[PDB]
Amino acid sequence: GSSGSSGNIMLLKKKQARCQGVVCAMKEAFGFIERGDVVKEIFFHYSEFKGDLETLQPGDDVEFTIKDRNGKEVATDVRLLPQGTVIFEDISGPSSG
């Protein structure tokens, strides 16, 4: 009997896709994100924004995931993006992401 309950072994977790842009609108309740290659924008609420509401300007790059929201397309679970030009360092490892 070879067929049965099997497990415990390497597991590949390759990334799928994502959508990011630039915070063009700055308000004390909600804002909008602008796209580069494409011209599609969405409405994101700061309440969902998971970052530093204290220091966010002028328009730090941000990420989001378009869902199948009924009515309009909004961005849920917004997460700020990393700095632009990366700088060398002495931290060799798997890194995040």
From Swiss-Prot:
CSD domain: which residues?
19-78
Query: Where located?
Result: Cytoplasm; Cytoplasm, Stress granule; Cytoplasm, P-body
Q: How does it assemble?
A: Component of a multi subunit autoregulatory ribonucleoprotein complex (ARC), at least composed of IGF2BP1, PABPC1 and CSDE1. Interacts with STRAP. Part of a complex associated with the FOS mCRD domain and consisting of PABPC1, PAIP1, HNRPD and SYNCRIP. The interaction with PABPC1 is direct and RNA-independent. Interacts with EIF4ENIF1/4E-T.
Question: What is this protein's function per UniProt?
Answer: RNA-binding protein involved in translationally coupled mRNA turnover. Implicated with other RNA-binding proteins in the cytoplasmic deadenylation/translational and decay interplay of the FOS mRNA mediated by the major coding-region determinant of instability (mCRD) domain. Required for efficient formation of stress granules. (Microbial infection) Required for internal initiation of translation of human rhinovirus RNA.
Q: Which family does it belong to?
A: Belongs to the UNR family.
Give the protein's recorded name.
Cold shock domain-containing protein E1
Gene for this protein?
Answer: CSDE1
